[PDB]
Curated annotation (Swiss-Prot), chain A:
Enzyme nomenclature, EC number: 5.4.3.10, 4.3.1.24
Keywords of the record: Alkaloid metabolism, Cytoplasm, Isomerase, Lyase, Phenylalanine catabolism, Phenylpropanoid metabolism, Taxol biosynthesis
Pathway connected to this protein: Alkaloid biosynthesis; taxol biosynthesis; Phenylpropanoid metabolism; trans-cinnamate biosynthesis; trans-cinnamate from L-phenylalanine: step 1/1
An annotated Gene Ontology molecular function: phenylalanine ammonia-lyase activity
Protein name stated in the entry: Phenylalanine aminomutase (L-beta-phenylalanine forming)
Ligand binding ((E)-cinnamate): N211, Q299, R305, N335, K407, E435, N438
Keyword Isomerase annotated: yes
An example Gene Ontology biological process: alkaloid biosynthetic process
Annotated signal sequence range: none
UniProtKB/Swiss-Prot annotation, chain B:
Modifications after synthesis and translation: Contains an active site 4-methylidene-imidazol-5-one (MIO), which is formed autocatalytically by cyclization and dehydration of residues Ala-Ser-Gly.
Active-site residues, record numbering mapped to chain: Y70 (proton donor/acceptor)
Residue positions binding (E)-cinnamate: N210, Q298, R304, N334, K406, E434, N437
Protein name per UniProt: Phenylalanine aminomutase (L-beta-phenylalanine forming)
Reaction(s) this enzyme catalyzes, per UniProt: L-phenylalanine = L-beta-phenylalanine; L-phenylalanine = (E)-cinnamate + NH4(+)
UniProt subcellular location: Cytoplasm
pH-dependence of activity, as noted: Optimum pH is 7.5-8.0.
GO biological processes: alkaloid biosynthetic process; cinnamic acid biosynthetic process; L-phenylalanine catabolic process; L-phenylalanine metabolic process; paclitaxel biosynthetic process; protein homotetramerization
Effect the entry attributes to changing N210X: Abolishes enzyme activity
Biotechnological exploitation: Could be used for the stereoselective biosynthesis of beta-amino acids via amination of cinnamic acid derivatives.
Assigned GO CC terms: cytoplasm
Subunit structure: Homodimer. Homotetramer, dimer of dimers.
InterPro entries cross-referenced by the UniProt entry: Aromatic_Lyase, Fumarase/histidase_N, L-Aspartase-like, Phe/His_NH3-lyase_AS, Phe_NH3-lyase, Phe_NH3-lyase_shielding_dom_sf, Taxol_Phe_23mut
Length: 639, 634, 639
């Protein structure tokens, strides 16, 4: 299952200490994300050294002998006609040319350090002709938290942004470098602060430094790591959605999916069946539909019932794109490719980031699809007509005139989904004929990756809101159960006290179980609201069925005492709740994490924290990966 | 002409000191942009006080009498069937509910603009907000105090506007800036400016949030920038004509009279004027008179089709400006209080659809502007299309270690590519929102943000284009001086070697005809075009007529003398622009910004040079050379 | 008001008999549309003949004398360096090379081809082109004889290739096929033969003059803009009909709301709507509806109605502004070079660039998507009982709703229509390729854009047809509703008397009869679990308590039993009778009367044999062929 794969990714992200780069051990997207986000993670370049020196020595030797080789004894790009024996100055001129970005905004340090690792990895294959020593310098800069400041834009995929890494290595004074989060110094000073001296570029070295896909793939790696975690988070929370909305778990039955066997359909449903088996909320759901069965929907709306079919292509896109991105991480993306064993330089296009670009477009569409699912679920949850007993906007009230609940989060979810759908148009359809028409196809992979990343930022917001709304719903469902029991108690005991016959008592107790408590919580004894309406109906029917002056007297008394006692008793239990079925739920880790670890409570006019303050905490734990602890606790035992 | 209107906008932006907000005087996109960007610009709220207090008094009194008015004695949005007499509590619960954004922010410029636009809406006397709240808004604006507001959450501007209301009522969770250096909770910010937290009266929560102030705020600075960058692009089309050796006839008035799209006539009229007595157009005429029948009859589209192309772009940007200003000067609020007729009117003036739709159109027009720049830049970089200029505008002379503006060229493709992507519409992604109450919504703030991102890219593209054109000016000027040397060296050496008149004429024609940048790298290289032509001539002069000895001696003396004298004038160089209308631009970039001709001998990177030009564009210093260049156009 | 302008367009389209083509009288989008769609409409070329002949002889002389002029003594496009004295062969070679379309048949329709021939003929009258007058006469004759070349759909970046087929017809190319009327296709030489024409031999500049125009893009844009104006006015108008059926509050259109936010399209649409709804018999019912249980019902309408003027504003402005732009292009010399024979120069420019039309086509497609979304939102409210203020879900008459799903099929199709429409509204203009050996490094793509906007308008017609059909259903449901409520009242009133109930009981019961939405219990009026008997039971119990006996209870039980006997019979009778009025006082009467009487339809139900397709097809056909303008004009009479 993809579920097990994603769990392995989260484990690797958490547990990796050294990233070994040796030209043989694969670097995964978890490794890239770990390097970028966890400062205790170090790069260990293992001495493929012989292969590198061999390649490097071949290049220098051949260049000096006057061999004809692109970008070493030849001009660059559309200028490959121009030959030269000015080996170093040819390389320096390229870097000077490519230091051509503008600060408007920058590629963040996380992406720049990731790009550095990716470039370093490419070099390990022994095809590039770069000096081993430059590789050691990359390792040292990576482990010392040194990275150049890089302009956001200018790559069609990543000459310009990689030129800043080359600019660092040769100590260009105009190249500003970061050391940790605050220090910014010129490149020479930065090299000095970490025990390095500027390099003088040898044959092919300028080009080797710049002629890769390191930036597009760096962003695509963290994008894919996040896509995997958030995918699993959304699949998992579909079960939590089912629990609070009173869904029918049958939607995830294995025969339905065996019979329409998209791998992502089978796998998501398998997860969901397991999550909802033995659920105490599904137990309540079954109870709910047994009361007035033929007045209630036979099936759920699509946002739940159709989730495994919806998720299927989304699962598959995110999983296949991960593979594609990792193939690029672990490639010699460079040109020429030096085939030193066979004494030749091979002329190709390994710098072309098209596999990443196209998959970035696809993933952005899948992410939009995840957002739409979240939006549809959130929309059902806010509307009384579709929420099977829950109050509109998940407003606790009881005074709804001064409690609009999660209406602000509802509006925001629409704004999120809308921008997310816009973002999901492709970048790859906008290929311009570039660089004196030499680059007449180009991948735009970094631009695409950047947009998929922005889409995932919005998805995090939507997940944060959704999970916050669902924790509200858990509290509302547990309070609902407790309040219905109080109503039943009060109605039952007042029926006894008033000497009402069994017929009357049976009718009144049915109304107490049947009518949704949130339709009358605001004013429980309001003769205009559903509880008294149902009770008055039953009282007329009891009179007719039993048909007298004694009975009417007693029913009038039952009503006076209900008016005296019921509201206080409902207030007592709600005030107590404010100051249990989730305990048997597989989503307990999520609820406990949000309520206890993050320190939140049921949202109402009495809790002084704003919706912002609640959702911000949940968002921050999604953003910084702490959300994976309750996720992993929730899924332990599965397969 | 729109050119006058845009110059009027630039002047207003530069000259405004006080923005009077009085319920009658229009606020323009220049006023808004000036407030946002110039800290010395102050708001002056003019005591329209009478109509504010009447409206305010009417709302509170009716609400206390128990009149049934939406959002004053009723629930909000889809909850409008719930009635209540809890007047202040109703308003407070709205703000609480709307403090629902997340920091993953809208900038201070946008926030202050939103504050001004809300204050402006209130002056029309339809909102029922207290005058005192308006005074607090004016004081907050002049004191540089602004709430920190989350970027996202509006479908257009409830959530972002709730942070301004949060500040005004002293919500502890709301953080305010005081200048650029201070951040404090809202109550502390109010304290430091001598204000007390407000207690919301009837309709006051809703009045503060029920506007289009953030969408319209971002759209105002978007439109100011779009006008200025539009004029800049149109103007620079003329500089492009000059450096590329274009034919100015493309801007002839009859061509456009006969296809009279207003943007087409007006842009062409500007271009005709810019190029009228051009020294560079004089060179262009000289260039095409040499081997006339081996050279293009017409320019390629990026120049020749520029007025036709600019036409819808001018018109879209002009029309969108009108629309945005109408919104700036509107009572965007609901209910609308018609106190003169004793009624509250229920409608949808909070709906930012005029702004949203026009934001979609302008982003498409900005993409069209970027495409034009990209096409022009591409031509400039390719020797086949640049009429004598070297590839990548590389000075060399050693082209093997000078790749010129190739970096900038690649970047231009990246800029255009992302720009074209951005220009898809936001307005087609309408979701049925807020318990299906908001089943149409404008998404205007989101659209405005994307158009703003598009303009950021356009600024990058303009900075690059202008920088290349300055490079190209230097290269055209060097070219003229180099050709004169070649001619002089050829002429004097022909004399010394005592060659016949037949010979001297053939060689001097070659010296005038072959483009100098084809052979600058190695002037006497026998495989390069100068000596190729010279050898052709020498064979022809032999067929047409010792003579051989005098020709071989010529070729040896040229081989010794020429490159040295070419290097001399080049090194000296390291003028026609003095007579050009684009002199202010060249002088601005070269002298004021302190730059020079780009080459391997210049230590400054392309980044360093383009950054200065970009910064001047971003901060509006570029309008000085722009206004000088346009001086006298009417 | 734009309303006056559009009514003007419609009048002109219906009334024009001859389109005068004279070089100074403007051709409007209505004239183009009338030529394309009404075959009795004729072209009249008015002998401008002088300046034309001056121009063509000027060009011929200059060319013969060897003057250097692009495309006359010069190669084309990127080949303009090449000179030639081969005047006719040059023009012949252009046409041969431009005959390069492929039939996939998909083709530009005859309507667009004939419109394009008109527009080319028009450009020529300005006397800048150098075409012979006799070629112009030939074009007039082909137009008046209904002869058109068959033109491949694609190939233009805007209209060399498509226009080459008109040129191919004129010179008698055997490979060019021509239509004569609707039933005949013959090769070009035979088509010319049949209308008394001989093949032309191209003179200097004539091949180029024929092909170097924006004729096809502008032809499709003209009929697009004509349709966009009509459909816009229709949508605006039908917003008023929506208010009437949905029980809206006409206040949303009050002139002060819009004076205070004065976007011209906002004021003008609201002005129309205020007028349409003033003194409305349906608005009278709406006012009564909200006066009953006032405080249980929404204070404001949802956005699809109340925000319609604000939504329409930019849509109106875009469509009106694009009409001007397109008409400026229709009335232009789109050709190059432009011959200024007065001053003996050929001016070299780019009037063939269709950018003005291209960019506006993109804007209008966006505006049309906005119109679709407005209809989709309104339609959605109408289908949902929770938002329709008493109307049954899906506008199902029933009464047995288990076998009548009403307009659910139309509801589903409306989502399918809107979805594709929103997709179409992405820009074409952002996809500029550097074309024609990099000569055309900007190009408008106007024809491609115009085609997409036309497709968008096809879908909008479908949506309007559905929306109008639904609102006529709703009219019937509202009128039946009023009749049914009066019967319930009468039966309850008289039965209360006859059962000897007290006056306070009678009054309580009559309140229930007035207040309960009849469509909530029509299925089974005396079902004890449905809202009528629910309210009656509550009222009966309250009566017993208030007057608190055995006689009262007997009479109340009798009342319930007898209502159970009579009410359904009476309700069935008035419904059956209705299937066998306030619309008569409504400004929308001509729409209802057009759809019901002239198109021969009825209330939709399980008893009507016609499918929704059959009903919507008729309305769609009427929208497509302009018959819908008849009730539009009647409705708007006096505005
Ligand atoms: N990636 C291309 C290039 C273009 C300009 C400067 C450096 C590199 C290339 F295709 F030419 C290549 O390096 O192979
Ligand atoms: N703008 C809408 C609204 C919705 C929720 C909270 C505040 C405001 C509205 F349509 F209902 C309105 O204010 O008119
Ligand atoms: N429209 C262009 C052209 C290109 C190829 C064949 C005919 C015409 C042109 F720009 F070159 C022109 O005709 O002006």
């Amino acid at each position: 299952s993809h579920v097990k794969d994603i769990l392995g990714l989260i484990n690797a992200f958490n547990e990796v200490k050294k990233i070994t780069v040796d030209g043989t051990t694969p670097i995964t997207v978890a490794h890239v994300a770990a390097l970028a986000r966890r400062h205790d993670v170090k790069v260990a370049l293992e001495a493929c050294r012989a292969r590198v020196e061999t390649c490097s020595s071949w290049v220098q030797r051949k260049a000096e002998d006057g061999a004809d080789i692109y970008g070493v004894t030849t001009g660059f790009g559309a200028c490959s006609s121009r030959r030269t024996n000015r080996l170093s100055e040819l390389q320096e001129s390229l870097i000077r040319c490519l230091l051509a970005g503008v600060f408007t905004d920058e590629l963040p340090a996380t992406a720049t350090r990731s790009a550095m690792l990716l470039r370093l990895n490419s070099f390990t294959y022994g095809c590039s002709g770069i000096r081993w020593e430059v590789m050691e310098a990359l390792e040292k800069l990576l482990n010392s938290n040194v990275s150049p400041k890089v302009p956001l834009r200018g790559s069609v995929s990543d000459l310009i942004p990689l030129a800043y890494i080359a600019g660092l290595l040769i100590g260009k004074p105009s190249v500003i470098a970061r050391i940790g989060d605050d220090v910014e110094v010129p490149a020479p000073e930065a090299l000095s602060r970490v025990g390095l001296r500027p390099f003088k570029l040898q044959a092919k070295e300028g080009l080797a430094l710049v002629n890769g896909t390191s930036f597009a793939t760096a962003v695509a790696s963290t994008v894919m790591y996040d896509a995997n975690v958030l995918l699993l988070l959304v699949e998992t929370l579909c079960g939590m959605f089912c629990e609070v909305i009173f869904g029918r778990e049958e939607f995830a039955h294995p025969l339905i999916h065996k019979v329409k066997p998209h791998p992502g359909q089978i796998e998501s449903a398998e997860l969901l069946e397991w999550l909802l088996r033995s659920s105490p909320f599904q137990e309540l759901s079954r109870e709910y539909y047994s009361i007035d069965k033929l007045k209630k929907p036979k099936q759920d709306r699509y946002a739940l019932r159709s989730s495994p079919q919806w998720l299927a292509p989304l699962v598959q896109t995110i999983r296949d794109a991960t593979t594609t991105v990792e193939t690029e991480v672990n490639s010699a993306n460079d040109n020429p490719i030096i085939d030193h064993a066979n004494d030749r330089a091979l002329h190709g296009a390994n710098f072309q980031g098209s596999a990443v670009g196209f998959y970035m477009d696809y993933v952005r569409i899948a992410v939009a699809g995840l957002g739409k699912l979240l939006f549809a679920q959130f929309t059902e949850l806010m509307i009384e007509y579709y929420s099977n007993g829950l109050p509109g906007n998940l407003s606790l009230g009881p005074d709804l005139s001064v409690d609009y609940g999660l209406k602000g989060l509802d509006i925001a979810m629409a704004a999120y989904s809308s921008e997310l759908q816009y973002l999901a148009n492709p970048v790859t359809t906008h290929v311009h004929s570039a660089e004196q028409h030499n680059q007449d196809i180009n991948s735009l992979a970094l631009i695409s990756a950047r947009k998929t990343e922005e889409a995932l930022d919005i998805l995090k917001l939507m997940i944060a809101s959704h999970l916050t709304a669902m924790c509200q719903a858990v509290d509302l469902r547990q309070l609902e159960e407790a309040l219905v029991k109080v109503v039943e108690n009060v109605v039952s005991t007042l029926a006894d006290e008033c000497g009402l016959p069994n017929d009357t008592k049976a009718r009144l107790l049915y109304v107490a179980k049947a009518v949704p408590v949130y339709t009358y919580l605001e004013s429980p004894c309001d003769p205009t609201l559903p509880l008294l309406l149902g009770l008055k109906q039953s009282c007329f029917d009891t009179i007719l069925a039993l048909h007298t002056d004694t009975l009417v007297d007693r029913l009038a008394e039952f009503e006076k005492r209900l008016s005296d006692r019921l509201e206080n008793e409902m207030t007592a239990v709600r005030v107590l709740y404010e100051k249990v079925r989730i305990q048997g739920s597989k989503f307990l880790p999520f609820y406990r994490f949000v309520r206890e670890e993050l320190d939140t409570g049921v949202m109402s006019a009495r809790r002084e924290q704003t919706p912002q303050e609640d959702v911000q905490k949940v968002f921050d734990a999604i953003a910084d990966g702490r959300i994976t602890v309750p996720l992993l606790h929730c899924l332990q035992g599965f397969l």
